[PDB]
C-alpha cells in the first residue's frame, strides 16, 4: 500500500529578503534552535490553524460545521497551552504568533522552569538523556508539552542528576 507522508516546512517565497532573514534569526538565537527549517516548521503549522480558523469564521455562527470544527480547534490549543480558557471563540486564534508556539517546546519549558540555566544547555540536556516527562524520558527538543504535563518534568532516574549514579567522566577519575 502507498504509505502516506507529508512535509513539515516550506521554503519562503522570496529567498533573500533582509527583513525576513533578520526576524528568523531573532527566533533562532532566542530559543537556541538548530537551523531555519524548524523555524519554517512552526510558521507552517501556525499557518494551518490560522488558515483553518479564518475559513470557519466565513461560515454562519449557528452553522453546525463551524461549531464542531471550531471547538475542536480550540481544544488542542487550550490543551497545548498556547491558548487560555478566556479566548472564545476564534477571533483570539488569529492573534497567535510564532513566538507563542515556541515557549511550549520542551527546550523552552525546561529553561522556564529553572531546570537549566541556559537555553543551549537546556537543549543539550534533553537530547543527552537527562530530562524526563512524568515517567517517560523524552529526548526530542520539539516535544510540545501540555499545561497538564508541564507539572511533571524532572531529571531522569538513570541520570547522575536525580538518579545519583556518577557518569562516565566521574567514574573515570575514581
Amino acid at each position: 500500500a502507498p504509505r502516506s507522508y507529508s512535509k513539515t516546512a516550506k521554503v519562503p517565497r522570496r529567498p533573500f529578503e533582509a527583513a525576513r532573514l533578520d526576524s528568523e534569526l531573532k527566533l533562532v538565537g532566542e530559543y537556541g534552535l538548530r537551523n531555519k527549517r524548524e523555524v519554517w516548521r512552526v510558521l507552517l503549522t501556525l499557518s494551518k490553524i490560522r488558515r483553518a480558523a479564518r475559513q470557519l469564521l466565513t461560515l454562519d455562527e449557528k452553522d453546525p460545521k463551524r461549531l464542531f470544527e471550531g471547538n475542536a480547534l480550540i481544544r488542542r490549543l487550550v490543551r497545548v497551552g498556547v491558548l487560555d480558557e478566556s479566548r472564545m471563540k476564534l477571533d483570539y486564534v488569529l492573534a497567535l504568533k510564532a513566538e507563542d508556539f515556541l515557549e511550549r517546546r520542551l527546550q523552552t519549558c525546561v529553561y522556564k522552569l529553572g531546570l537549566a540555566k541556559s537555553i543551549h544547555h537546556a537543549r543539550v540536556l534533553i537530547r543527552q538523556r537527562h530530562i524526563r516527562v512524568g515517567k517517560q524520558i523524552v529526548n526530542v527538543p520539539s516535544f510540545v508539552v501540555r499545561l497538564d504535563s508541564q507539572k511533571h518534568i524532572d531529571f531522569a532516574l538513570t541520570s547522575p542528576f536525580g538518579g545519583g549514579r556518577p557518569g562516565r567522566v566521574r567514574r573515570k577519575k575514581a
Partner: protein
C-alpha cells in the same frame, strides 16, 4: 589574440598559497549562536 594553445594560462600562472589552519568553527545549533550574538547582541 586568443588560441587553443592558451588554455589554462592564468591557472598555471597563479602561485599556490596554502590555506591558514584555524580553530574549527562550531556546527549546527552553536554556529547560529555566535551569528545571533554578533548581529543582535554585540551591538
Amino acid at each position: 589574440h586568443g588560441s587553443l594553445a592558451r588554455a589554462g594560462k592564468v591557472k598555471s600562472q597563479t602561485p599556490k598559497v596554502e590555506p591558514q589552519e584555524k580553530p574549527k568553527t562550531p556546527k549546527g545549533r552553536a554556529h547560529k549562536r555566535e551569528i545571533y550574538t554578533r548581529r543582535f547582541v554585540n551591538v
